[PDB]
């Protein structure tokens, strides 16, 4: 009947403090337990891989969020680097309370974990996206830790060439968390993409790298862009969408190009075989740097008869537009392609990945979807109709139909009513009018035993920013309320950030302050007990912040309009004492690249924070163990326990 | 008539700022900024737009990048000189500067190329060309240039207007001249093997090609690849970590009865340690298994007599096999349990008191339950008693610590070596048993037998190896599991992971995969000691090094490049290899891994055919008379 609870994230990162949660449950009033918790290495006797931290839990202060320090000296001396098969380690809580009171076989209760030598964050940018053979390559790296503060650990950098061989290697200390370096491309080197990797010296699994292209090129004077009127084309048998495109052709320095636009058309498959149109070629004069070309509906079906196909054979595929203009007095030419204009079946895209599974019978099922334009932005104001058919538990099936428009950025949140004793749930989701997009989904019920079920609902379906206090409601469904308290914890970036309790009431609520520690993604895992069996549920809430902790604003003032050689005052503004790494890049390099490389923005910084996220899916579970290990936790109460996962697979 | 032109009404050329600095990236600096900072800098001569990015790294507010600045430069009257990528010497090209006029005035601009040494221009370079450029339009001015020099020629193109409206621009840009001939790559592939004697040292020929341009040499690079992984498909294992957890038992009855529970409990713990399957179980099961050995170590100490002799009860006389069987176990439990070292030193002293005159071991009274002895009971009982103490004294040899028992340790190995004179005499006889040969030759290779008396028990054991199907062994038989298990521990010492041991390990894994696991005492303990030694030996690959050294003599003098490859992270290495010419190169190779060497010598080759337009064709012929100015006669 009494339990000791032990929580940790499923993957330990070495050199990083490991967040360990400990909790007493169903303990009498005048009881105080004591003990320790540490990482232990089996098969090297019981030598610890961490110094222990002591914990003390009373009956009224029955939970403690600990920070177990994981040093690299104790992790190598215990023997984890000399281990075979796979990277596995054990978190062990030691207390004589389990032996001298609960009469269990050991004074030990723990869990099985994975360990990783991947730590910190390394960001690195180059001098250029594309370089000629024989040109200097400058690169900088930036060393940070888990707390997004600059780190001082010694790193190793290497440069791999176009075939993939190490041509340069430096191991340098980080007193100021940066490293500038320069090297030269060989004069007779083949074209390709190179790879600059950075890695900590004692952290063996620190993948962080960016790539640059090597190509023979002379720098262009003007960039050619091919913009269609729509990013899609409907292949409905009754209606065909129009095929009109606009070729803006401007110089790099602003002014439009006086020239003649020469256009060829064609079709392209998934393998990469180009099939051109013999005939139907366009040759137009540029006025104000633009060329609005149009492909007629009578000319389009005539070209398919030359290729002996029809309008029903456009199920996959994409329409290929290659354009090469010539400057009408200059004699200079540049090319441009258009390779992302697919033949589609619907102008909208369905994303039901935010809709959770394994949902509680007797609770409302939260159908949350994302409506996006086809190869474009998320669209708002689109109606979504859901036909929900509940299958038979022994009675007749019943059909529900609930319609709701999309609020903002394609977010729709449709609650549908699910009763008790469901067998399965079949969904038929239709979105858009006319020509809808369809999606089918079959979700399974929990098994017919029922220890109790827990429902988590979200009243405000808006994604909050940093500073918004979000409210959530908790109701226990389907069993007798023999419990007294709910217990919750907030999971973010593969650590346990905050952990607290909340007393049980009629209509029970809790407020969670969305902090900047809680990432663009955080989890909310809450549970209780019904006797000696766990009942759990979880929920994923994303944060739409997208802002720095400090700031960095660059500004060149005035009304622009600068000549060459003039003096420019570049203004630098920041919130703290900061090292500011700068660079002024030529926009004409973006037209010379065959594949235009995408550099470093702030959106790549926020997705590096969720690389340490250990959870898969929106949350939930038909079991109470499947809630925990889909959130990324490992747990043991003494009888039920989680198995160790197999890296970040999640089938 | 229609020949209106300007004639030295033009500006001074030196009053035109010449455009010469055209980079593609600039402002590459790191500044230390205390809140606010202004950098006053100078724009380059390239007429594009600039994207200025920035990255802040503060110690208190962390990392932040900036929204980039589109900074646009514009000269309004300018000329753009886009070069070709590479032009050969004595190849006539057309330089095409294009005048650009974004003003609302009909201009008249004279354009000349400044005469630089290394270019043959039209008229020597002093001649200029006028053209009038309309308002809001652009005009090209062609120049037919042939180069002369081999390196680089900095040419300047100057465009100047009149004093009716003073316009002007000048571009100076360095032209790159390609060397004489075409490029030529030569690959000299060499499959490396420093192991055995296939390429431990070698020489490479030179390249005195008669197609070589004599001054157009390039650098020649070396690159080396060690494409040698390790295929995992040869170690399925798949022995169940649940039936081994059923073997973690508490010691129960007397001295015989304890060891059929205690010695499979230690052999389950020593298996699950060395196969590292404690993650499939809770970690409470490990600390349970320590306490089963911790209570069981000092449980047999109640049965310990006052001379190091062991029996089932205290009133029963002592047995020789059982005293060796506990000395085998408690020596391995000295790592787990910090017991008394010197009490086990007198345990082996009683076993040396029953030494025969020829080197045998004799048991005066055996144990009661002879199913604990396993496959020892037979016609060769005297051979199996002698080899089992030889296993037992070698495991107990590590308990002999410091120098206090080291003179008694000399008496241990002298009684082993006299028993090797008796076990080696029975092994060189020939006709032994199936179980009696497997326990004999494994005991010889532990205690370091002489190799003429060691290998004759190796070949006699390998003759008894009746295999069928895709299995190799010596409905489940209970007695044949122990015989295969002693032979698998011996085979890993002579040929570690061999062609037969990879398949003979897979046989008795299937024998332990039946319901109930193994069905006696000795086939449980030794086979879990055999498959634990196999699973380490099948997952221990570490082939590395590949030391390689190259050396040459010539234009550089003597120089040499040495490099080691293998840390088994990197897929290959490439270096610059600044060596001489195509002459005189010596290679010395070391290490012990498979490699692939490629030497990429690049140089300039012959000219051959021009191949001047054989697919497409274009021709143009003009006739008539054009008025000209200046020139000479």
């Amino acid at each position, epitope marked *: 009947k009494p339990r000791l609870l032990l929580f940790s994230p499923s993957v330990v990162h070495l050199g990083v403090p490991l967040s360990v949660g400990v909790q007493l449950q169903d303990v009498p009033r005048g009881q105080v337990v004591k003990g320790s918790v540490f990482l232990r290495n089996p098969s090297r006797n019981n030598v610890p891989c961490s110094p222990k931290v002591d914990f003390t839990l009373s009956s009224e202060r029955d939970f403690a969020l600990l920070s177990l320090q994981v040093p690299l000296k104790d992790a190598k001396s215990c023997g984890l680097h000399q281990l075979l098969r796979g990277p596995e380690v054990q978190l062990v809580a030691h207390s004589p309370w389990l032996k001298d009171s609960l009469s269990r076989t050991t004074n030990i209760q723990g869990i099985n974990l994975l360990f990783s030598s991947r730590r910190g964050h390394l960001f690195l940018q180059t001098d250029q996206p594309i370089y000629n053979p024989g040109q200097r390559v400058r690169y900088r790296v930036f060393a940070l830790d888990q707390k997004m503060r600059p780190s001082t650990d010694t790193i190793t950098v290497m440069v791999e060439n176009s075939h993939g061989l190490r041509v340069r290697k430096k191991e340098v200390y980080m007193p100021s968390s940066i490293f500038q370096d320069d090297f030269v491309i060989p004069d007779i080197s083949e074209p390709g993409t190179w790879k600059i990797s950075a890695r900590f010296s004692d952290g063996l699994e620190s993948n962080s790298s960016t790539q640059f292209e090597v190509k023979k090129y002379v720098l262009p004077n003007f960039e050619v862009k091919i913009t269609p009127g729509k990013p899609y084309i409907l292949t409905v048998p009754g209606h065909l969408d129009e095929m009109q495109l606009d070729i803006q052709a401007r110089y790099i320095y602003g002014k439009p190009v006086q020239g003649v636009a020469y256009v060829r058309f064609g079709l392209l498959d998934e393998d990469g075989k180009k099939t051109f149109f013999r005939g139907l070629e366009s040759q137009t004069k540029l006025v104000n740097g633009q060329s609005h070309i149009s492909l007629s509906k009578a000319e389009f079906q005539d070209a398919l008869e030359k290729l002996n196909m029809g309008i029903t054979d456009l199920q996959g595929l994409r329409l290929y537009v290659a354009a090469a203009i010539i400057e009408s007095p200059g004699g200079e030419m540049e090319e441009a392609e258009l390779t992302s204009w697919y033949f589609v079946s619907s102008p909208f895209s369905l994303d039901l990945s935010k809709t959770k599974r394994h949902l509680v019978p007797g609770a409302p099922f939260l159908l949350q979807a994302l409506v996006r334009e086809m190869s474009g932005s998320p669209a708002s104001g689109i109606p979504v109709k859901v036909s929900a058919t509940v299958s038979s538990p022994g009675s007749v099936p019943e059909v529900q139909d609930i319609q709701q428009n999309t609020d903002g950025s394609g977010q729709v949140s449709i609650p549908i009513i699910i009763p008790q004793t469901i067998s399965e749930l079949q969904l038929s989701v239709s979105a858009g009018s006319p020509h809808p997009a369809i999606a089918r989904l079959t979700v399974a019920a929990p098994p017919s035993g029922g220890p109790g079920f827990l429902s988590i609902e979200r009243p405000d379906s808006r994604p909050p920013r940093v500073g918004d206090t979000l409210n959530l409601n908790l109701r226990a469904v389907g069993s007798g309320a023999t419990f007294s308290h709910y217990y919750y914890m907030i999971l973010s970036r593969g650590q346990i950030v905050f952990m607290n309790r909340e007393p049980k009431r009629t209509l029970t609520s809790v407020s969670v302050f969305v902090d900047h520690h809680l990432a663009p993604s955080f989890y909310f895992v809450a549970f209780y007990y019904h006797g000696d069996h766990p009942v759990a549920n979880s929920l994923r809430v994303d944060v739409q912040a997208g802002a720095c902790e400090g700031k960095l604003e660059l500004s060149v003032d005035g009304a622009k309009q600068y000549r060459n050689g003039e003096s420019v005052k570049l203004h630098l503004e920041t919130d703290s004492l900061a090292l500011v790494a700068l660079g002024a890049l030529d926009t004409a390099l973006y037209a010379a690249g065959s594949k235009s490389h995408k550099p470093l923005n702030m959106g790549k910084v926020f997705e590096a924070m969720n690389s340490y996220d250990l959870g898969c899916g929106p949350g939930g579970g038909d079991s109470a163990l499947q809630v925990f290990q889909a959130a990324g936790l490992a747990f043991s109460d003494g009888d039920q326990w989680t198995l160790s996962r197999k890296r970040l697979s999640c089938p | 008539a229609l020949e209106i032109l300007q004639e030295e009404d033009l500006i001074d050329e030196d009053d035109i700022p010449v455009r010469s*600095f055209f980079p593609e990236n600039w402002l590459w600096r790191v500044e230390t900024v205390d809140r606010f900072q202004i950098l006053t*800098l100078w724009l380059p001569d390239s007429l594009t737009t600039w994207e200025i990015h920035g990255l802040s790294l503060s110690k208190t507010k962390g990392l932040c990048v900036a929204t980039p600045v589109q900074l646009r430069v514009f000269r309004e009257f300018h000329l753009h000189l886009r070069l070709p990528m590479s032009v050969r010497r004595f190849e006539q090209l057309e330089l095409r500067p294009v005048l650009y006029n974004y003003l609302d005035k009909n201009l008249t601009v004279s354009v000349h190329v400044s005469p630089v040494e290394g270019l043959c221009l039209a008229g020597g370079g002093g001649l200029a060309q006028q053209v009038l450029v309309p308002a809001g339009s652009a005009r090209p001015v062609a120049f037919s240039v042939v180069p002369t020099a081999a390196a680089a020629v900095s040419l300047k193109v100057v465009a100047r207007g009149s004093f009716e409206f003073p316009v002007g621009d000048a571009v100076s840009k360095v032209l790159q001249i390609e060397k004489e001939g075409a490029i030529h790559r030569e690959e000299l592939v060499y499959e490396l093997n420093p192991l055995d004697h296939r390429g431990r040292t070698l020489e490479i020929p030179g390249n005195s090609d008669p197609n070589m341009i004599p001054d157009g040499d390039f650098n020649s690079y070396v690159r080396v690849t060690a494409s040698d992984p390790l295929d995992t498909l040869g170690s399925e294992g798949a022995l169940s970590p649940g039936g081994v957890a059923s073997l973690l038992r508490l010691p129960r009855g007397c001295g015989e009865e304890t060891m059929i529970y205690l010695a499979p409990t230690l052999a389950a713990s020593r298996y699950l340690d060395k196969t590292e399957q404690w993650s499939t179980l809770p970690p409470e099961t490990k600390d349970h298994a320590v306490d089963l050995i911790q209570k069981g170590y000092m449980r047999i100490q109640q049965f310990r007599k006052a001379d190091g002799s062991y029996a089932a009860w205290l009133s029963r006389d002592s047995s020789t096999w059982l005293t060796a069987f506990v000395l085998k176990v408690l020596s391995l439990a000295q790592e787990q349990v910090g017991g008394s070292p010197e009490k086990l030193q007198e345990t082996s002293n009683w076993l040396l008191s029953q030494q025969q005159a020829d080197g045998s071991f004799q048991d005066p009274c055996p144990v009661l339950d002879r199913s604990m002895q396993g496959g020892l009971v037979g016609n060769d009982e005297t051979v199996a008693l002698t080899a089992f103490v030889t296993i037992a004294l070698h495991h107990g040899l590590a308990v002999f610590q410091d120098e206090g028992a080291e003179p008694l340790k000399q008496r241990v190995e002298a009684s082993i070596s006299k028993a090797n004179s008796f076990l080696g005499e029975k092994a060189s006889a020939g006709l032994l048993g199936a179980h009696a040969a497997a326990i004999t030759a494994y005991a010889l290779s532990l205690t370091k037998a002489p190799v003429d008396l060691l290998g004759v028990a190796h070949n006699n054991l390998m003759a008894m190896a009746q295999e069928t199907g895709d299995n190799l062994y010596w409905q489940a038989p209970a007695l044949w599991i122990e015989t295969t298990a002693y032979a698998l521990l011996h085979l890993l010492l002579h040929e570690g992971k061999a062609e037969m041991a990879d398949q003979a390990s897979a046989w008795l894994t299937r024998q332990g995969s039946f319901q109930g696991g193994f069905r006696s005492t000795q086939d449980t303990v030794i086979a879990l000691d055999a498959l634990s030694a196999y699973w380490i030996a099948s997952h221990t690959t570490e082939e590395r090094g590949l030391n390689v050294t190259l050396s040459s003599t010539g234009r550089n003098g003597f120089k040499s490049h040495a490099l080691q490859l293998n840390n088994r992270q990197i897929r290959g290495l490439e270096e610059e290899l600044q060596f001489s010419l195509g002459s005189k190169i010596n290679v010395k190779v070391g290490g012990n891994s498979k490699g692939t060497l490629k030497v990429l010598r690049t140089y300039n080759v012959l000219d051959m055919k021009n191949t001047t337009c054989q697919d497409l064709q274009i021709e143009v012929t003009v006739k008539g008379h054009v008025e000209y100015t200046m020139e000479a006669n």
Partner: nanobody
Amino acid sequence: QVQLVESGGGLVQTGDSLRLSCAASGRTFSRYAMGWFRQAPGKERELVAAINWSGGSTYYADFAKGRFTISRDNAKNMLYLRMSSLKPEDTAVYYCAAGGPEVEITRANEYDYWGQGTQVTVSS
């Protein structure tokens, strides 16, 4: 290296004009950017004026706008400083300095080559 020689300075009264000169040896003078600095006795170096390596645009300090004029002649390898309206707080050793194209203006340490400096003393 490319070297610098200053001339033109001397004793003068308050409110007069002066023409400074900076001679430059070497051949790659058009590739480097120039700038006249000054250093008061007791204080560090500060900028007076600076001109581009091509001689296309100029930069002046906040006290030097309007009163002073910098010019470049790349055909004679000369640098001038046409000065007017002098004050007694302008008394400094006037230096002539060379730097690259990607150089900053207020940083004195980032310039490459230097001269010896000429003395301009303004009395009242």
